[PDB]
Enzyme design. Structure first.
Site, PDB file in Angstrom:
ATOM      1  N   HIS A  73      26.853  50.091  39.991  1.00  0.00           N
ATOM      2  CA  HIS A  73      26.040  49.046  39.397  1.00  0.00           C
ATOM      3  C   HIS A  73      25.379  48.248  40.522  1.00  0.00           C
ATOM      4  O   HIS A  73      25.964  48.087  41.585  1.00  0.00           O
ATOM      5  CB  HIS A  73      26.955  48.191  38.510  1.00  0.00           C
ATOM      6  CG  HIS A  73      26.326  47.056  37.765  1.00  0.00           C
ATOM      7  ND1 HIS A  73      25.837  45.925  38.360  1.00  0.00           N
ATOM      8  CD2 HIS A  73      26.201  46.885  36.418  1.00  0.00           C
ATOM      9  CE1 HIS A  73      25.391  45.097  37.417  1.00  0.00           C
ATOM     10  NE2 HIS A  73      25.602  45.675  36.206  1.00  0.00           N
ATOM     11  N   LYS A  75      33.362  40.522  29.444  1.00  0.00           N
ATOM     12  CA  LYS A  75      33.636  41.910  29.082  1.00  0.00           C
ATOM     13  C   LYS A  75      35.071  42.141  28.598  1.00  0.00           C
ATOM     14  O   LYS A  75      35.346  43.192  28.022  1.00  0.00           O
ATOM     15  CB  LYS A  75      33.331  42.825  30.271  1.00  0.00           C
ATOM     16  CG  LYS A  75      31.841  42.982  30.524  1.00  0.00           C
ATOM     17  CD  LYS A  75      31.483  43.602  31.859  1.00  0.00           C
ATOM     18  CE  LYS A  75      29.991  43.574  32.116  1.00  0.00           C
ATOM     19  NZ  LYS A  75      29.618  44.607  33.077  1.00  0.00           N
TER      20      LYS A  75
END
Ligand SMILES: [Zn+2]
Ligand SMILES: [Zn+2]
Lengths: 143, 406, 408, 141
Positions: free
Chosen positions: C125, C226
């Site tokens: 990422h 998350k």
């Protein structure tokens, strides 16, 4: 009503009439912790006992009274015993009121039991005591 | 309508350990939350929670709308354009952002050896330590305006020269309560082509703020002081400046192109927002702005300054009490910091707390200011829209009680 | 798992979407939904105990400070760290930035300079890529990377570490290919070089048991939103002995010990790394999320997610023209499942799924180098959480078939 | 679903007009779905004689660029710019502007995209690319 439970007679007495205040000689170590305190420890010729604790600084009633009481409880004591007294004080004031403390060990120190329920003021109480432990460890190594 | 305002805040009903109802005079540290703010955030989270600025499902669209409408509502409140606000975790981070960008080689206005940064001795540490670090990293020099005896910026204590590239200063002291002469400081800054950085953490909650009108280059404020959530701060920067600035934090969201070798960066304000934003907190902060806006900030300011005047009068009527800052109400608001002769602030604070009155004791993150007046600590009563005249009287009585007890 | 009971904790899962169907949220990889337990913990704190933290000395300050520090302890227990080894940030991205800035600071003895190599991976990422690009830029260090295998794993043969390598950064768990990386191997190779390891654990902490001490990494980052927690809170883990050696990143109030106009001294870790007012109510919320997931049990969470992923791969693999980005095998693999549909652009796939009430992410998922390595511009990505069901997987597979029919 | 994916869109998607980069041209641009797009002006610079493009993207981005080429090729430069603004207003409206079929032609088929703000950027890609390339081609003239 409950304000006297934190500010007990013993604390107010030591705040007004502090014991062993004013830096003195001789000393074997000196430290500065911050309520602030400059604190010295003197050991005996053979290095087994605390002969003097001298201190100076500015702080609230609880910080000044705790240091006053500290000096009375540890002057004349053996080095290992003085450290034991500190650990008992620390356990009591850090207990949130679940440990009342043993007056045989702490003496007037038990008057700071009511401080335990006020976590913010625990650091006020512990300032001089943690200062002493530091200066005691330094004075012992210097020996 | 003060009774109706107070009914919006659940915490204000709380009974404290001494049996006394809460009198919260520490909004300067953090404000309390009305149902309107709590509910806006919770309604967003249970209905529309999705990732922002992604493709392309319905929750994403609703989240993005709430985020960008929130930015727009907050910008309206502080007199900025929508694209001139950057969200940070707190005001401190916003001031740090500016201080890091000003040492970046890619910024045309970056500071280096021979350049001078100016701050003030009145400042909260958030508007001091970043400048110390910027000077350390770049080899620039830090200078500062002094403080007058009544706790104001001493405009005569420093002459700016052409070396001065940054002038940072508070809008409103978090200790002395002084409202600073922004237009004069901006005028003087501009004589050397210096950027202005305004710490507005205590103005945005307490008075009308129009950042365009103030003419500053950057400003920082925090949400949790203006009835909003924790974890959200705001940096204002003029559109033209933001366009010239390289990013601070980098990662997802703030890029345009990426290879393993390098990246190009989004336009402002997205350039300065790396990773997932504090989405529900933006919704809550926008709710706080609409709540304060509904009351009207002129009315908020008038009410607070009534409380402050009564505090100063009440405290001034006690022997041995001295105010840190002006006793006059000229260019002065919240808070009221004070010392009690013969009674340590920690003890003053404890007696007040026994009466259910919450004040801050210490240096209030303004140690240079306290040192300037030879003080270790003060007690500080700060006032918000939800505070009352009776709470002020309870403060005065508590300070009296502390004298009699010690 | 009592899945009916778990799903009942999440109000949003009851919602009927614009196309008339109940929400099937398969985008937890972007942000997870919140249980009542987390929403209620934060609201109860804010309406009862809201005060300044660590700045004294009234009753609400004591309660706030207690909530803050107990929250830190609860989160530390969940991820197998000591309490003093966690630093709170606004998000995981900021945590990785913190490390990247301190590693360019002259006061840090492990700081990098010309001649030094920083290593990342092509799987990463952007949060675990761009900060290393910037650290290289500021210091004159050189950036190198591991490549990716054909099945979307870190290619361990694609790069050899030598004694120049000072930092090795890598994902624990890919947010695209779903691969679980060989942490112990990479830590072993990093230690040969004397390099520090930086673990992006954003997709592991929500989906699998994590013990940061056992992993032996130097630093790790993860994000609250998350793992069922609030927005606006991230976590940096650092080994106690490393945090002790590190200069501050952000400066201001709270993180100082002494201050004059001329200079300042700094608090010990973790306070050294937390400048200004912290995200107090979000710490309370995140601790509630940790306790929630802890109550379910992360081994059970992982087993349930692996079931859903295996079914999604089977179902999607059964559609002609559908290819998975990442392994078809469940070996060292979890959420998510990213895929391409032959002759149907990801944006269109996503629109068809959304019409059926199925939320997936379409795009590069902030891993553009990974997509480019496979010659792709965009994928559709279904990510799975503890509250997802077999029926939602079936609706995903059906929606993908519908997309092929409607376009093809 | 057919309200967003009109037959018009699907037609232009499968059967794109004026696709493939061609010469001559007066300016080329690249915007990002992605498109490389060229504009050619008449000898007197008053009209758009050609729009050529190339790129990968979804049905909506491809179809919108195809429909663009039909609407602006042969148009006067200020008129082409007016058409672009009308398309922009319609798709950015959230479904509160249906759009004028006299101005937009097949462009009105994208009216249904306006309710899906995520896909507005898909629709606008080719149009904004054209607007950019037209300004460049005029300055070049
Ligand atoms: Zn004290
Ligand atoms: Zn598209």
């Amino acid at each position: 009503l409950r304000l006297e439970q934190i500010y007990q007679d013993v604390i107010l007495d030591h705040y007004k009439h502090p014991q062993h205040r004013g830096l003195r000689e001789p000393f074997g170590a000196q430290v500065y912790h911050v309520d602030e305190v400059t604190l010295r420890v003197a050991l005996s010729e053979d290095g087994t006992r605390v002969t003097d604790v001298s201190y100076d600084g500015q702080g609230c009633s609880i910080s000044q009274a705790a240091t006053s009481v500290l000096t009375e409880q540890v002057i004349g004591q053996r080095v290992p015993r003085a450290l034991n007294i500190v650990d008992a004080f620390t356990e009591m004031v850090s207990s949130r009121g679940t440990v009342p403390g043993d007056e045989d060990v702490l003496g007037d120190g038990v008057a700071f039991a009511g401080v335990a329920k006020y976590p913010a003021r625990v650091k006020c109480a512990l300032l001089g005591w943690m200062a002493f432990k530091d200066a005691l460890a330094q004075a012992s190594e210097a020996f | 309508d003060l009774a109706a305002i107070r009914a919006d805040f659940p915490i204000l009903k709380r009974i404290m350990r001494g049996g006394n109802p809460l009198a919260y005079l520490d909004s300067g540290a953090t404000s309390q939350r009305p149902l309107q703010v709590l509910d806006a955030e919770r309604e967003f989270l249970t209905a529309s929670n999705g990732a922002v600025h992604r493709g392309a499902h319905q929750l994403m669209e609703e989240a993005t709308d709430a985020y960008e409408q929130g930015r727009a509502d907050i910008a309206l409140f502080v007199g900025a354009d929508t694209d001139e606000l950057v969200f940070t975790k707190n005001a401190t981070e916003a001031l740090n952002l500016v201080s890091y960008v000003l040492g970046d080689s890619r910024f045309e206005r970056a500071v280096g050896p021979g350049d001078v940064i100016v701050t003030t001795e009145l400042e909260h540490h958030a508007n001091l330590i970043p400048w110390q670090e910027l000077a350390r990293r770049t080899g620039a020099t830090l200078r500062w305006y002094g403080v007058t005896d009544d706790g104001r910026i001493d405009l005569d204590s420093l002459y700016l020269d052409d070396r001065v590239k940054v002038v940072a200063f508070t809008h409103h002291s978090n200790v002395t309560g002084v409202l600073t002469p922004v237009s004069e400081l901006v005028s003087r800054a501009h004589q050397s082509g210096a950027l202005t950085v305004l710490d507005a953490c205590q103005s945005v909650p307490h008075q009308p703020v129009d950042l365009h009108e103030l003419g500053v280059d950057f400003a920082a404020f925090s949400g949790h002081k203006m009835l909003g959530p924790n974890g959200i701060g705001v940096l204002y920067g003029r559109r033209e400046l933001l366009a010239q600035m390289p990013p601070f934090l980098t990662g997802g969201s703030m890029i345009e192109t990426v290879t393993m070798e390098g990246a190009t960066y989004a336009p402002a304000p997205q350039r300065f927002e790396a990773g997932t934003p504090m989405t529900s907190q933006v919704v809550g902060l926008a709710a706080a702005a609409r709540y304060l806006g509904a009351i009207g900030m002129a009315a908020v300011e008038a009410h607070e300054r009534e409380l402050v005047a009564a505090a100063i009068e009440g405290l001034s009527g006690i022997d041995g009490v001295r105010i840190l800052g002006p006793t006059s109400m000229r260019d002065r608001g919240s808070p009221v910091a004070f010392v009690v002769e013969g009674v340590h602030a920690h003890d003053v604070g404890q007696v007040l707390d026994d009466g259910g009155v919450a004040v801050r004791v210490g240096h209030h993150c303004a140690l240079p200011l306290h040192r300037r007046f030879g003080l270790a600590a003060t007690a500080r009563a700060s006032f918000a829209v939800y505070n009352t005249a009776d709470e002020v009287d309870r403060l005065v009585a508590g300070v009296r009680r502390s004298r009699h007890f010690f």
